[PDB]
Amino acid sequence: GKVYKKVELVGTSEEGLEAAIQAALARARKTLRHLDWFEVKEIRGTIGEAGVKEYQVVLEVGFRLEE
Amino acid sequence: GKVYKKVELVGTSEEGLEAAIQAALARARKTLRHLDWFEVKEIRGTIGEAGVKEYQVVLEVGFRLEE
Amino acid sequence: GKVYKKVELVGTSEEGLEAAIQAALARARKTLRHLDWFEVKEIRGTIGEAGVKEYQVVLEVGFRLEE
Amino acid sequence: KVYKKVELVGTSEEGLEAAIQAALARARKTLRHLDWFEVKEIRGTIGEAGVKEYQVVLEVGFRLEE
Amino acid sequence: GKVYKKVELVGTSEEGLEAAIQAALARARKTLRHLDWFEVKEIRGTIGEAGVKEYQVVLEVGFRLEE
Amino acid sequence: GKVYKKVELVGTSEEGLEAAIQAALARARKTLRHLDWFEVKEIRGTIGEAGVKEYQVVLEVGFRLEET
Amino acid sequence: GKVYKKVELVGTSEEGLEAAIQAALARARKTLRHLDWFEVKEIRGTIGEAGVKEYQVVLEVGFRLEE
Amino acid sequence: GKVYKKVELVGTSEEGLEAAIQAALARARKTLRHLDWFEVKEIRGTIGEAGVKEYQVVLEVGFRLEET
Amino acid sequence: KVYKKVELVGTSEEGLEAAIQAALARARKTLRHLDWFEVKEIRGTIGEAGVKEYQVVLEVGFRLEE
Amino acid sequence: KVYKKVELVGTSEEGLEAAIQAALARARKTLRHLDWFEVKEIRGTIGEAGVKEYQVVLEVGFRLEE
Amino acid sequence: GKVYKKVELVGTSEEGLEAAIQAALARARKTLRHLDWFEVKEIRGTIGEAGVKEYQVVLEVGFRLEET
Amino acid sequence: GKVYKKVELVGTSEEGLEAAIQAALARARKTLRHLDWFEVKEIRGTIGEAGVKEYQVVLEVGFRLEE
Ligand SMILES: Cc1cc2nc3c(=O)[nH]c(=O)nc-3n(C[C@H](O)[C@H](O)[C@H](O)COP(=O)(O)OP(=O)(O)OC[C@H]3O[C@@H](n4cnc5c(N)ncnc54)[C@H](O)[C@@H]3O)c2cc1C
Ligand SMILES: Cc1cc2nc3c(=O)[nH]c(=O)nc-3n(C[C@H](O)[C@H](O)[C@H](O)COP(=O)(O)OP(=O)(O)OC[C@H]3O[C@@H](n4cnc5c(N)ncnc54)[C@H](O)[C@@H]3O)c2cc1C
Ligand SMILES: Cc1cc2nc3c(=O)[nH]c(=O)nc-3n(C[C@H](O)[C@H](O)[C@H](O)COP(=O)(O)OP(=O)(O)OC[C@H]3O[C@@H](n4cnc5c(N)ncnc54)[C@H](O)[C@@H]3O)c2cc1C
Ligand SMILES: Cc1cc2nc3c(=O)[nH]c(=O)nc-3n(C[C@H](O)[C@H](O)[C@H](O)COP(=O)(O)OP(=O)(O)OC[C@H]3O[C@@H](n4cnc5c(N)ncnc54)[C@H](O)[C@@H]3O)c2cc1C
Ligand SMILES: Cc1cc2nc3c(=O)[nH]c(=O)nc-3n(C[C@H](O)[C@H](O)[C@H](O)COP(=O)(O)OP(=O)(O)OC[C@H]3O[C@@H](n4cnc5c(N)ncnc54)[C@H](O)[C@@H]3O)c2cc1C
Ligand SMILES: Cc1cc2nc3c(=O)[nH]c(=O)nc-3n(C[C@H](O)[C@H](O)[C@H](O)COP(=O)(O)OP(=O)(O)OC[C@H]3O[C@@H](n4cnc5c(N)ncnc54)[C@H](O)[C@@H]3O)c2cc1C
Numbered sequence: 123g124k125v126y127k128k129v130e131l132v133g134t135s136e137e138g139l140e141a142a143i144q145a146a147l148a149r150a151r152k153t154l155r156h157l158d159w160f161e162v163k164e165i166r167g168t169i170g171e172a173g174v175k176e177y178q179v180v181l182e183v184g185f186r187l188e189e
Numbered sequence: 190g191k192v193y194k195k196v197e198l199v200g201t202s203e204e205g206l207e208a209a210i211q212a213a214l215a216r217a218r219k220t221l222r223h224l225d226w227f228e229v230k231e232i233r234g235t236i237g238e239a240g241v242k243e244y245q246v247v248l249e250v251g252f253r254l255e256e
Numbered sequence: 257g258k259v260y261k262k263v264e265l266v267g268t269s270e271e272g273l274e275a276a277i278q279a280a281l282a283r284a285r286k287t288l289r290h291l292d293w294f295e296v297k298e299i300r301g302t303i304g305e306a307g308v309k310e311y312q313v314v315l316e317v318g319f320r321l322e323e
Numbered sequence: 324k325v326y327k328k329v330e331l332v333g334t335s336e337e338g339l340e341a342a343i344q345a346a347l348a349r350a351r352k353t354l355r356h357l358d359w360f361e362v363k364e365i366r367g368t369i370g371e372a373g374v375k376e377y378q379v380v381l382e383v384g385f386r387l388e389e
Numbered sequence: 390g391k392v393y394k395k396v397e398l399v400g401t402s403e404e405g406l407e408a409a410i411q412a413a414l415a416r417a418r419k420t421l422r423h424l425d426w427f428e429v430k431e432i433r434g435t436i437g438e439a440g441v442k443e444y445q446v447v448l449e450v451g452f453r454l455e456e
Numbered sequence: 457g458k459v460y461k462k463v464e465l466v467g468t469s470e471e472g473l474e475a476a477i478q479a480a481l482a483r484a485r486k487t488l489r490h491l492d493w494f495e496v497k498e499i500r501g502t503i504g505e506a507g508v509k510e511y512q513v514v515l516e517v518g519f520r521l522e523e524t
Numbered sequence: 525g526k527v528y529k530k531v532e533l534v535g536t537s538e539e540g541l542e543a544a545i546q547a548a549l550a551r552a553r554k555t556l557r558h559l560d561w562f563e564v565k566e567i568r569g570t571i572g573e574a575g576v577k578e579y580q581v582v583l584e585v586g587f588r589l590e591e
Numbered sequence: 592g593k594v595y596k597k598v599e600l601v602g603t604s605e606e607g608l609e610a611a612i613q614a615a616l617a618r619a620r621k622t623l624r625h626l627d628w629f630e631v632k633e634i635r636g637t638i639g640e641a642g643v644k645e646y647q648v649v650l651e652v653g654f655r656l657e658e659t
Numbered sequence: 660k661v662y663k664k665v666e667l668v669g670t671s672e673e674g675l676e677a678a679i680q681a682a683l684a685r686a687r688k689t690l691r692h693l694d695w696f697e698v699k700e701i702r703g704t705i706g707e708a709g710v711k712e713y714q715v716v717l718e719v720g721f722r723l724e725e
Numbered sequence: 726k727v728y729k730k731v732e733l734v735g736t737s738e739e740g741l742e743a744a745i746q747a748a749l750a751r752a753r754k755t756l757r758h759l760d761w762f763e764v765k766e767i768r769g770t771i772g773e774a775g776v777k778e779y780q781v782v783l784e785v786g787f788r789l790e791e
Numbered sequence: 792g793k794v795y796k797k798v799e800l801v802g803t804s805e806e807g808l809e810a811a812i813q814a815a816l817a818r819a820r821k822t823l824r825h826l827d828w829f830e831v832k833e834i835r836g837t838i839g840e841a842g843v844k845e846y847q848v849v850l851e852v853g854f855r856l857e858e859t
Numbered sequence: 860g861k862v863y864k865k866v867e868l869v870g871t872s873e874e875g876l877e878a879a880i881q882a883a884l885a886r887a888r889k890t891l892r893h894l895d896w897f898e899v900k901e902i903r904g905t906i907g908e909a910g911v912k913e914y915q916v917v918l919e920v921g922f923r924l925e926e
């Protein structure tokens with residue numbers, strides 16, 4: 123039947139988790155078609171003078187392949 | 190001693206992670222008593238024209254059983 | 257063929273590990289029939305003035321579903 | 324929407340798909356809005372002729388009424 | 390020495406597990422050369438009116454990279 | 457009380473998953489006694505010109521050991 | 525070369541996940557130097573009349589050791 | 592240097608966890624040499640009319656192999 | 660509130676509970692506000708009479724002073 | 726910034742580091758802004774003289790162009 | 792079809808990781824046949840006055856079993 | 860009986876894996892007594908102009924606690 127592919131991306135944001143996820147999805151849309159779902163694999167980040175410097179959300183993005 | 194039960198629910202929200210968690214907990218309260226804690230097992234979601242379509246947070250909800 | 261169900265319970269006891277497991281199984285028997293096996297998922301607990309206060313054993317209890 | 328996941332173990336002497344079908348058929352007896360499943364484990368018992376009973380442990384997700 | 394690459398695909402089929410796996414490998418062959426092995430990561434699916442609707446097998450496909 | 461042992465085998469077959477599992481169990485039967493249960497640890501395989509070449513199912517086979 | 529140490533902390537907040545993470549990082553800065561990165565290990569929490577009572581984020585905080 | 596081997600056994604006992612572990616170690620001693628350490632992999636069991644029927648502790652037993 | 664988790668390995672020739680008690684007793688010597696523990700691993704050494712030393716690896720959580 | 730992670734398996738008859746270097750060298754052929762790697766698995770093949778080929782499965786992270 | 796078996800061994804060496812892996816494979820060769828692949832499960836070791844004393848690599852060794 | 864403690868360190872080195880492990884153990888010895896064993900949790904690193912820049916080995920170091 124249909125076949126999907128999953129790519130692993132890492133979105134980042136200085137503001138929050140949702141923002142980091144949205145950033146990765148927005149970049150994905152630039153070159154990928156038929157984006158369907160995502161799975162968060164890891165949540166990490168860097169530390170700076172303001173506490174969190176960058177939130178880094180590692181996720182798998184699943185999209186349908188064309189035939 | 191006391192015995193607790195853990196049920197697995199999936200809360201969803203178009204707005205964010207916390208909202209999805211709160212949605213699952215609110216639904217849990219409708220039929221379950223003595224809700225005590227929760228554990229997030231997975232964070233995933235669907236993708237749409239606005240990026241994230243639905244955030245889906247899979248969690249275990251622990252509550253005390255009556256004797 | 258036959259179908260079984262697994263429920264997740266957390267047995268607790270101030271006596272010890274075995275007692276915590278037994279507490280969960282005793283409560284399970286109150287509303288579940290055809291209890292067959294259990295699987296320990298986690299062993300944890302609270303700390304008191306002189307050591308372990310309450311042992312908490314998270315387990316899955318498997319039982320056969322009726323007709 | 325809020326979904327719930329229950330854990331069932333389907334069994335069958337025939338094969339993996341049959342074991343999964345057995346669990347879903349029983350789920351349907353009392354659960355509405357069945358949507359997806361996830362296989363957690365595949366195991367089974369052994370007899371003189373090899374596999375006696377195939378056992379598929381799965382999580383079944385369904386939408387809760389609101 | 391040689392270097393291989395692994396891509397993550399989700400093969401789907403309404404026929405069964407093997408068919409889902411075969412669907413993923415058939416699509417992989419369309420754009421990937423020197424396909425060598427696969428590893429199943431997850432088996433899941435959707436539910437229909439009378440049982441499994443679509444089987445979905447998440448797998449990693451390993452292939453040798455060219456010069 | 458009783459003690460069981462678990463051996464890890466990889467059954468293979470060009471036919472399918474069930475056939476691969478059965479191949480491992482058939483082999484275990486040649487030199488082991490009291491085979492009771494199995495647990496699938498991994499499912500993988502090789503690829504050929506027609507898709508799956510060989511299905512490979514990694515499993516643990518549990519059997520009862522004879523009493524002292 | 526350089527050597528880092530990782531400590532496990534649990535930040536809490538009644539308001540959200542990011543707030544809980546920031547709380548742990550702020551406490552870490554009180555006694556630790558050279559804070560560099562963090563990794564979320566678990567997200568859980570307590571339940572109250574308002575739904576979530578306390579969000580609890582378990583994280584590893586990595587920092588460089590001095591020589 | 593030295594090489595060790597690990598075997599997987601499931602000790603059982605109606606008495607408790609420690610007893611189940613001891614049962615597996617006692618059995619390992621019958622045919623193995625240089626038993627050094629063990630690691631509990633899983634704790635499970637069967638259920639009877641009075642709660643736990645049989646405790647089952649799955650463990651890996653590590654032992655030293657004789658030098659070449 | 661902010662908590663910290665440390666990893667200790669309690670040991671005892673007696674049993675699992677005794678091993679856990681040993682780790683908690685040592686934790687109490689230098690750590691305040693001990694609240695909970697989580698068993699990470701259960702292992703041990705072997706002697707001529709079976710278990711020599713039971714070893715319980717656990718994480719101990721305690722509240723940090725503010 | 727947004728990064729991407731690809732999974733490669735480097736191999737070498739020499740050792741672990743050489744296997745890792747092999748994967749990174751191939752990655753560099755088509756991927757820009759290579760930043761970090763994570764070893765997922767270490768395995769290999771066996772021959773008459775022991776290890777034939779060391780195989781290191783790793784994830785390679787790189788920054789995507791914006 | 793064909794069936795393989797996997798044994799778990801811990802190779803050790805004061806020299807390094809590769810040497811530890813090689814030690815386990817050399818030992819496996821003494822009593823096993825058709826050794827085909829290995830998988831590292833864990834890397835650990837002991838500590839001495841000069842840092843690492845003994846490297847210990849836990850691995851699974853897969854080999855083909857003879858046909859029925 | 861005896862009680863041991865495990866600390867998590869990340870040894871780094873531009874020389875190789877063993878060197879990274881040795882760096883962590885050398886630093887550990889500076890403030891920890893009765894060092895006994897170590898367990899590798901992760902192997903990772905940074906990438907430079909011609910390959911691995913810095914190897915980073917995350918490990919747990921176990922040592923015996925004193926009276
Ligand atoms: C392994 C697996 C895991 C899954 N996990 C989840 C989960 O966690 N939650 C969940 O709710 N569902 C999940 N799904 C279901 C998934 O999100 C889809 O609903 C399902 O796979 C059906 O997809 P499709 O065939 O319609 O693909 P689609 O890609 O939806 O099919 C064509 C559609 O693509 C749209 N499209 C075209 N260009 C683009 C573009 N550039 N970007 C985006 N869309 C575009 C078109 O408008 C068209 O309607 C999962 C599926 C699989 C296989
Ligand atoms: C395996 C396990 C994991 C845990 N993990 C955590 C954790 O991550 N974080 C943490 O802080 N604690 C955790 N706990 C502790 C837990 O949250 C409780 O504080 C503890 O178990 C004591 O619960 P209880 O017996 O007071 O139950 P309770 O259910 O609190 O006992 C009775 C109480 O129920 C209340 N109640 C009645 N009806 C309802 C209702 N409909 N909804 C809600 N409450 C109602 C009553 O007002 C009454 O005070 C965990 C406990 C276990 C066993
Ligand atoms: C995924 C899976 C994992 C398993 N893991 C293990 C394991 O770790 N260890 C192990 O040893 N086995 C394990 N088993 C086997 C299991 O424990 C059973 O032996 C097996 O599933 C067969 O169960 P059954 O059909 O006989 O069920 P049963 O529940 O034994 O069938 C009905 C029985 O229930 C009794 N019963 C029900 N309610 C009552 C009551 N109120 N009062 C008195 N009697 C009552 C009846 O008298 C009757 O004999 C596992 C099975 C599966 C499917
Ligand atoms: C955590 C999570 C993981 C997911 N994983 C996957 C995945 O792996 N693959 C994938 O493809 N999708 C996956 N999904 C998506 C899922 O399959 C659904 O498509 C999605 O959740 C939307 O469901 P719904 O609200 O339409 O529910 P539905 O349950 O579809 O809504 C009501 C439907 O129930 C039917 N119904 C109720 N009772 C009966 C009955 N007795 N007999 C027949 N029909 C009946 C009605 O006819 C009606 O159409 C996932 C979703 C979540 C939240
Ligand atoms: C990390 C890892 C894990 C592995 N896991 C397994 C496992 O689970 N099971 C197992 O059995 N093996 C496994 N292997 C082994 C693997 O399957 C290969 O046998 C091994 O890597 C050697 O591959 P190769 O260099 O011969 O590649 P190949 O891809 O076999 O080399 C080139 C071949 O590709 C053919 N080819 C390419 N494109 C086409 C085309 N379009 N039409 C026709 N022919 C074409 C050529 O004719 C040529 O013979 C694994 C290997 C690694 C590195
Ligand atoms: C850790 C653990 C996990 C388990 N998981 C499961 C599970 O997933 N599912 C489940 O249903 N049960 C499971 N069990 C239960 C198991 O399958 C047994 O039913 C139970 O342990 C009782 O075994 P026994 O003492 O009767 O052993 P045995 O005496 O070995 O039982 C009789 C068995 O011996 C075999 N046998 C007899 N003679 C021979 C011979 N000459 N050659 C080869 N075989 C022979 C028979 O075919 C039969 O299966 C589990 C048990 C344990 C301890």
Ligand SMILES: Cc1cc2nc3c(=O)[nH]c(=O)nc-3n(C[C@H](O)[C@H](O)[C@H](O)COP(=O)(O)OP(=O)(O)OC[C@H]3O[C@@H](n4cnc5c(N)ncnc54)[C@H](O)[C@@H]3O)c2cc1C
Pocket residue numbers: 166167168169170178526528553556557558559560561562586587588869871903915917
């Ligand atoms: C195992 C591992 C995992 C990693 N994971 C990630 C990741 O997920 N994401 C990522 O982006 N990077 C990650 N890194 C990289 C990490 O964040 C650093 O960028 C890198 O390790 C270099 O650190 P450093 O030597 O400069 O240390 P630094 O501590 O940055 O070196 C000295 C610096 O400390 C500053 N400093 C002094 N006092 C304090 C204080 N009290 N609090 C804070 N800073 C102070 C000084 O101003 C000075 O510039 C990881 C590194 C390792 C080893």
Ligand SMILES: Cc1cc2nc3c(=O)[nH]c(=O)nc-3n(C[C@H](O)[C@H](O)[C@H](O)COP(=O)(O)OP(=O)(O)OC[C@H]3O[C@@H](n4cnc5c(N)ncnc54)[C@H](O)[C@@H]3O)c2cc1C
Pocket residue numbers: 593595620623624625626627628629653654655702703704705706707714801835847849
């Ligand atoms: C991967 C790994 C993990 C480890 N994990 C742990 C751990 O969790 N905890 C820990 O404390 N140590 C652990 N160890 C250390 C281990 O227990 C040994 O102390 C160490 O490996 C040194 O062993 P050895 O070379 O002295 O072996 P051996 O020569 O096997 O040591 C002497 C042992 O032989 C036994 N023995 C002698 N004759 C016989 C006989 N005739 N029949 C049966 N047994 C006999 C003795 O009872 C004694 O235990 C681990 C080692 C490795 C490699």
Ligand SMILES: Cc1cc2nc3c(=O)[nH]c(=O)nc-3n(C[C@H](O)[C@H](O)[C@H](O)COP(=O)(O)OP(=O)(O)OC[C@H]3O[C@@H](n4cnc5c(N)ncnc54)[C@H](O)[C@@H]3O)c2cc1C
Pocket residue numbers: 300301302303304305312534568580582660662687690691692693694695696720721722
């Ligand atoms: C990530 C996480 C996981 C959790 N998991 C669980 C779980 O599995 N089970 C569960 O039941 N709960 C669990 N909890 C809840 C936990 O046990 C506490 O109930 C909760 O964190 C609230 O702690 P507190 O702020 O009251 O701290 P406390 O430390 O209880 O506050 C101060 C207390 O310290 C005592 N104290 C300080 N020094 C000493 C001393 N030397 N001797 C004696 N007493 C002393 C004081 O008497 C005082 O009562 C968890 C919490 C978190 C954050």
Ligand SMILES: Cc1cc2nc3c(=O)[nH]c(=O)nc-3n(C[C@H](O)[C@H](O)[C@H](O)COP(=O)(O)OP(=O)(O)OC[C@H]3O[C@@H](n4cnc5c(N)ncnc54)[C@H](O)[C@@H]3O)c2cc1C
Pocket residue numbers: 132166178180726728753756757758759760761762786787788903904905906907908915
């Ligand atoms: C999820 C995650 C995990 C991480 N884990 C770790 C970790 O384990 N350890 C750690 O230390 N850090 C880790 N990091 C941090 C990482 O290594 C980077 O330091 C960080 O992501 C910042 O990268 P950058 O934006 O500067 O990208 P860069 O790619 O460094 O930015 C552009 C650079 O690319 C170079 N470049 C491009 N093409 C070529 C070419 N062909 N040849 C040579 N140079 C070229 C340019 O010269 C330029 O300097 C992690 C980061 C994330 C997001």
Ligand SMILES: Cc1cc2nc3c(=O)[nH]c(=O)nc-3n(C[C@H](O)[C@H](O)[C@H](O)COP(=O)(O)OP(=O)(O)OC[C@H]3O[C@@H](n4cnc5c(N)ncnc54)[C@H](O)[C@@H]3O)c2cc1C
Pocket residue numbers: 466500512514768769770771772773780793795820823824825826827828829853854855
């Ligand atoms: C679950 C699984 C995982 C795998 N993972 C990998 C992987 O990670 N990487 C990879 O490259 N391949 C992997 N393989 C492939 C594997 O290494 C084999 O290439 C493949 O299974 C084919 O084996 P065979 O049937 O030729 O066996 P065999 O007949 O065993 O193959 C010949 C082998 O026998 C050995 N041999 C012959 N005579 C002797 C003797 N007298 N003493 C000792 N040894 C002798 C040779 O040295 C040679 O290696 C995997 C296979 C499976 C089933």
Ligand SMILES: Cc1cc2nc3c(=O)[nH]c(=O)nc-3n(C[C@H](O)[C@H](O)[C@H](O)COP(=O)(O)OP(=O)(O)OC[C@H]3O[C@@H](n4cnc5c(N)ncnc54)[C@H](O)[C@@H]3O)c2cc1C
Pocket residue numbers: 668702714716835836837847861863892893894895896897921922923
């Ligand atoms: C959970 C667990 C896991 C284990 N895993 C392994 C494993 O993977 N491999 C393995 O082989 N073993 C393993 N072990 C065994 C471990 O390495 C020890 O051999 C065992 O715990 C016994 O330790 P001990 O009590 O002798 O401690 P020790 O620390 O050996 O006791 C005190 C010793 O420290 C020395 N010392 C302290 N500071 C200094 C100093 N500054 N200068 C000189 N000497 C100093 C003293 O001279 C004295 O001999 C494990 C043990 C446990 C509990």
Ligand SMILES: [K+]
Pocket residue numbers: 138139140205206207540541542
């Ligand atoms: K958030």
Ligand SMILES: [K+]
Pocket residue numbers: 338339340405406407472473474
């Ligand atoms: K099948």
Ligand SMILES: [K+]
Pocket residue numbers: 272273274607608609674675676
């Ligand atoms: K006990």
Ligand SMILES: [K+]
Pocket residue numbers: 740741742807808809875876877
């Ligand atoms: K090395």
